[PDB]
Structures are given as C-alpha cells and as structure tokens.
C-alpha cells in the first residue's frame, strides 16, 4: 500500500470483504472464478501482478526480456519467499506450470498454456508427451525462461492470472488434496491462510515473509461467502462489511445511489453477462433455436428497465471496450424488438415448435438475488415474445460451475470476465478444445480465425480477425449476449487504495489501508 502523506491510519488494520459465494478451492490450478481469484491474489503471487490501476507490473519477477516475442526470460527477485521462509525459485515455476499442463491435474485452466502458446502444450494435454516436455526451464534459481511456439507480443499480460501462480511442491506432494488446509498450506503472496470455515468465512493474515511485507498495511482480511446481494448490502450498512462483492441488488440499488453516493463505486469492467447455451444438446444444437432465443430477449427491458445500474446492452461476447477490440455491431441489434420477435417466432416455427408442442427448457443460475430477478424477467420476456416456457433452477456456485462443465444443462446464466486485457482472453474460451468452453461450441471456422491472429505480425489484421471471429460466433448464435457489466460495489469511506481504474478488478489487499474513523 502507498499511504498518502497526511492520511491518519486507524489503529486496527482489518478488512471484511464479501466474496459472493463459497470458493471452489484455494488451489490455483483448480480454480476458475472471480471469488476464487479474489482470494488467490492475496495468497499466491506469480511472475507479474497488476498495480493499483491494473497495469502488469513486477511480481516475483523484478524484470524480464523477450526475444522475438517467443523466448521470455524472467529475472526473479532474490528475496521472494514462501510463508515458511523458504525461497521462491524458478524451479517452483517450472514445477507449477508443468502441474497446470499435466492432464492428471485436470485443471479447468490447462488451456491457459495454449492461450500463451507455451511450447509442447498441445501434446502434453493430449497425453502424447509428459508434462516435463513443457517449454519452461529454470536457468538458475532466480531465472525462469519460457519458450513459445509462435510470437505472442502480449504474452506477459497473461501472467497476472492465478493459474500461472506457483504452488508449493512439498505441500502438494505430502498432503494431496488437503495441501490447502490451514495447517498444511504454504503461500507466497502478501497473506497467509489463518482460517477456512466452509460457508462462513475465510480469514487471511499478513505474511511476514512476503518480499514487499514492509509496504503491506492490512493485518487481516476476512472473505465472506454471501450470495444474497441484499444481505451483503445489509451487512455492509450495519457495519460488518467494509467492501461488498460487486453484484448489486435490484431491490436496493436506486436508493443506495441517492442515499450514499460517495460509497457507490461504479467503473468500467471487462465482463459480459450472457445466457450460455449448451450447444451440443438437442434442441440447442439447432441454430434456429439458438438464434430465436438470442433475438427474442429484449436487452433494453433488461438493462434499462429491470436492472438499470449502468450496464450496456450487448451484441457480442468480447466487450467492445477491450484493448484491441474493434467490433462490428450486427444488423439485428439495430432492429426494433418487434422485428427481432417476428424473426425469432418464424425460426422456432421453422424448427418444428408449435403452440401445442412448445419449446420448454431449463434456465440454470447460481443462487443470487440479482440472477434470480434477471432470470424471472428473461423467462417472462421469452414467454411473451416467443411462446417458450422456462423452468428456473438455482444451484450453489461451486455446483453450478461443475454442472456447466458436465454439460448437464440446457441454458445457463453466465458472466465471463477478462483474465488479460486483449480480445483472445474472451475468444480463446470458444475454441473447440478449450478447457474453458462450457458453451460446448465447436466451430472449425471460428478456430481457424483465431489461429490466424498470431500468424500475422500486424495489429489491424489481428483486430479485423477478432471482429470476424465475433461475427462467426454471432452467426452461429453460440450464446445469448445480454449486457456488458459495469463494476458496481459499495466501499466504506475509510477504505483507502481502491482506485476502480482497473477494468479487470484485480484487487490486492496488500494495496489497501484503513483510514482512521
């Protein structure tokens, strides 16, 4: 934390943040969501980290170079240490990236190493080469060298993500799936794990071995698993919670903006809310069915009338304000909703659906006041506009994500947030073989458009190909885009250090401080 000259600090430097739900795990190679990543950034530190405004900055690596955007050499700071006092070395990164790649780990983010094109990753994922063939090596204890199979100019932006953070080999090998319990875990970020009570709280305490420990101010941070956005706001206003999660309740938001304007933070955020269609399951494997759902949903009603929090109606997967996005707004987006509805109804009639034998399916969402209200509105809009019936189903966060990976669904509420600020952070998740592809979409045409992006050494050709990739996705109606999120949350006046300038919202509790109050 960089405490401004003249600010008086509170005597007790503790923070309470709501975190939306119970995390999937604390193992960096098994997590894939925002709640998970919020805790991960406080515990595990990769090569680079985001600064307080979101810019890629030195993490364990103090400096790095690249040769032709293909060989990247990271010089690790000599005082980086784990919480047990042992040094963080390049060997930890070799072991860690190999563990991520290894199919026995079954990481949902194994494909992150494909997104960065580390050498031999395809073969390793396929089981043709052992994980030790991965294109990473420790040149010495403090030098980690990564070899890619093609030039990737933005490669270093990828390194702030939890999947490429180090994990402690000795704890992993000795305790297996219990390595992350408090008595066994070993961490290298600014914090250490104090307590973990499922469905109650996660409590982290300052890690005195952290290399930048002298600049850490908060001594303890608690993460809560409250999925009700109304309850989160109530516990914030009662004084229990210092920072809500960044899902706001439809019930209270308009009132909050007029009641405590200086505490309602609303900033740009590179996330898209959509309905994820299971593309491999009939009748959702018919493009006419997907197109009808896409068109018949009324984004103006949802965005400006039911939610009205500042979100923008969406027509793509990649947010248009992503660095490198120059998207073409499809013609259907400029039509009236009435014209969209007619096209939608016509397509379902063509697909065989009638009043007597309508289209009825499930709409799965994770337990939430906001998602439930949105799903209710969507079900009503689809019923009225297209004659389709939906059965809403809620599941807790961890289970919900597992269901989407299983493909044991029809349509699911969804939100993808960038991992790095470049269009492939979204687009790579729709590749046929991506470990993140829970839409279960497989398009050779889409795949080829993306593969071609690193075969040009030109940004304009790259941007045009991303635009074309979004046009292929839209053509196939792989998803139902709803809105581009804004990052809206409540933050007490005494919480210093939160700029809201990072469109990825990669907060580190080591950067915050409690002002005397």
For 348-386, the DSSP string reads HHHTT--SSS--EEEEEEES-HHHHHHHHHHHHHHHHHH
Would you say 445 and 431 are in contact if contact means Cβ atoms under 8 Å apart? no
- Report the SS3 class of residue 178: helix
> In this structure, what is the dihedral angle of CA atoms 452, 456, 460, 466, given to the nearest 10 degrees?
20
Count of helices and strands (H, E) across the chain: 15, 18
CA angle 152, 153, 156 (to 5 degrees): 90
- Among 492, 500, 517, 494, which residue's Cα sits nearest to residue 233? 492
- Among 270, 266, 193, which residue's Cα sits nearest to residue 506? 270
Alpha-carbon distance 121 to 141, whole Å?
Answer: 23
Question: Which letter, b or e, does each residue of 48-84 get, where b requires 16 or more Cβ atoms within 10 Å of its Cβ?
Answer: bbbbbebebebbbbbebebeebbebbbbbbeebbbbe
Alpha-carbon distance 87 to 14, whole Å?
Answer: 28
Alpha-carbon distance 186 to 28, whole Å?
Answer: 12
- Report the SS3 class of residue 493: coil
443 alpha-carbon distance from chain centroid: 23
- Among 501, 504, 440, which residue's Cα sits nearest to residue 158? 504
Distances (CA, A) of 437 to 110, 242, 272, 277, 397: 12, 35, 15, 11, 17
For residue 71, the cross-strand partners are 67, 147
Alpha-carbon distance 170 to 205, whole Å?
Answer: 22
Alpha-carbon distance 426 to 428, whole Å?
Answer: 6
- Region label for 157, one of left (φ > 0), alpha (ψ between -120 and 50) or beta (otherwise): alpha
Q: How many CB atoms lie within 10 A of CB 474?
A: 22
| Cis? peptide before 172, omega within 30° of 0 | no
Give the tokens for residue 209.
Answer: 């071995």
- Structure-solving method: X-ray
Distances (CA, A) of 58 to 62, 313, 348, 462: 5, 36, 53, 27
The angle, 0 to 180 degrees and rounded to 10, between the axes of the packed helices 229-237 and 369-386 is: 140
In the 3-class helix/strand/coil scheme, how is 291-346 assigned residue by residue?
HHHHHHCCHHHHHHHHHCCCCEECCCCCCCCCCCCCCCCCHHHHCCHHHHHHHHHH
- Among 504, 324, 326, 502, which residue's Cα sits nearest to residue 423? 324
Helix (H) or strand (E) holding 427: helix 424-427
Would you say 485 and 415 are in contact if contact means Cβ atoms under 8 Å apart? yes
Would you say 83 and 183 are in contact if contact means Cβ atoms under 8 Å apart? no
Provide Rg for the chain, Cα atoms: 23
DSSP class of residue 303? I
Question: Which letter, b or e, does each residue of 163-189 get, where b requires 16 or more Cβ atoms within 10 Å of its Cβ?
Answer: bbbbbbbebbeeeeeebbeeeebbbbb
Would you say 18 and 181 are in contact if contact means Cβ atoms under 8 Å apart? no
Find tokens 């269009």 and name the residue. Answer: 423
Burial of 201 (0-12, 13-18, 19+ CB in 10 A): middle
Q: How many CB atoms lie within 10 A of CB 131?
A: 19
Please name each of the domains of the chain with its CATH number. Answer: 1-44+169-270+487-517 (3.40.190.10), 45-168 (3.90.76.10), 271-486 (3.10.105.10)
- Report the SS3 class of residue 173: helix
What is the pairing mode between strands 360-366 and 411-417?
parallel
Alpha-carbon distance 516 to 495, whole Å?
Answer: 10
- Among 82, 109, 80, which residue's Cα sits nearest to residue 97? 109
Strand order in the sheet with 143-147: 61-67, 71-76, 143-147, 136-140
Backbone angles phi, psi at 485, to 5 degrees: -65, 155
Would you say 266 and 505 are in contact if contact means Cβ atoms under 8 Å apart? no
229 alpha-carbon distance from chain centroid: 19
Would you say 453 and 466 are in contact if contact means Cβ atoms under 8 Å apart? yes
For residue 224, the cross-strand partners are 18
Cβ partners under 8 Å of residue 301, min gap 6: 377, 381
Helix (H) or strand (E) holding 489: strand 479-490
- Resolution (angstroms) stands at 1.8
CA angle 431, 481, 413 (to 5 degrees): 85
Give the tokens for residue 117.
Answer: 């094109």
Backbone angles phi, psi at 114, to 5 degrees: -80, -40
Alpha-carbon distance 431 to 447, whole Å?
Answer: 6
Burial of 274 (0-12, 13-18, 19+ CB in 10 A): buried
């Amino acid at each position: 934390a960089d405490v401004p000259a003249g600010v008086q600090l509170a005597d007790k430097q503790t923070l309470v943040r709501n975190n939306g739900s119970e995390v999937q795990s604390l193992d960096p190679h098994k997590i894939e969501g925002v709640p998970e990543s919020n805790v991960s950034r406080d515990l595990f530190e990769g090569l680079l980290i985001s600064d307080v405004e979101g810019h890629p900055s030195p993490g364990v690596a103090e400096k790095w170079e690249n040769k032709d955007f293909k060989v990247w050499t990271f010089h690790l700071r000599e005082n980086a240490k784990w919480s047990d006092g042992t040094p963080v070395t390049a060997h930890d990164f070799v072991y860690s990236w190999q563990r991520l790649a290894d199919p026995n780990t079954a990481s949902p983010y194994a494909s992150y190493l494909q997104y960065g094109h580390i050498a031999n990753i395809d073969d390793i994922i396929a089981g043709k080469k052992p994980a030790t063939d991965l294109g990473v090596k420790a040149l010495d204890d403090h030098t980690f060298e990564v070899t890619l199979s093609e030039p990737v100019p933005y490669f270093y932006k990828l390194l702030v993500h939890p999947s490429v953070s180090p994990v402690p080999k000795s704890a992993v090998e000795k305790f297996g799936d219990k390595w992350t319990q408090p008595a066994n875990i070993v961490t290298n970020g600014a914090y250490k794990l104090k307590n973990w009570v499922v469905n109650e709280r996660i409590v982290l305490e300052r890690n005195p071995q952290y290399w930048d420990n002298a600049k850490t101010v908060i001594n303890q941070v608690t993460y809560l698993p409250i999925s009700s956005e109304v309850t989160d706001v109530n516990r914030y206003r009662s004084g229990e919670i210092d920072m809500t999660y960044n899902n706001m309740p439809i019930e209270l938001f308009q009132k909050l903006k007029k009641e405590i304007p200086n505490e309602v933070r609303v900033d740009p955020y590179l996330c898209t809310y959509y309905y994820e269609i299971n593309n491999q399951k009939a009748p959702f494997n018919d493009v006419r069915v997907r197109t009808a759902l896409k068109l018949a949903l009324d984004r103006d009603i949802i965005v400006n009338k039911v939610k009205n929090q500042g979100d923008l109606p969406a027509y793509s997967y990649t947010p248009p304000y992503t660095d490198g996005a120059k998207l073409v707004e499809p013609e259907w987006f400029k039509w009236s909703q009435q014209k969209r509805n007619e096209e939608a109804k016509k397509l379902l009639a063509e697909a065989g659906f009638t009043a007597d034998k309508p289209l009825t399916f499930d709409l799965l969402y994770n337990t939430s006041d906001l998602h439930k209200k949105l799903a209710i509105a969507v079900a009503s809009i689809w019923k009225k506009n297209l004659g389709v019936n939906v059965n809403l189903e809620n599941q807790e966060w961890k289970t919900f994500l597992d269901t989407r990976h299983q493909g044991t669904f029809d349509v699911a509420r969804a939100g993808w947030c960038a991992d790095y600020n470049e269009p492939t952070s979204f687009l790579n998740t729709m590749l046929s073989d991506s470990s993140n592809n829970t839409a279960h979409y497989k398009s050779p045409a889409f795949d080829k458009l993306i593969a071609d992006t690193l075969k040009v050494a030109d940004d304009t050709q790259r941007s045009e190909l991303y635009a074309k990739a979004e046009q292929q996705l839209d053509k196939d109606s792989a998803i139902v885009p709803v809105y581009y999120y804004v990052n809206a949350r409540l933050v007490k006046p005494w919480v210093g250090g939160y700029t809201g300038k990072d469109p990825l919202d990669n907060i580190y509790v080591k950067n915050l401080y409690i002002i005397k109050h």
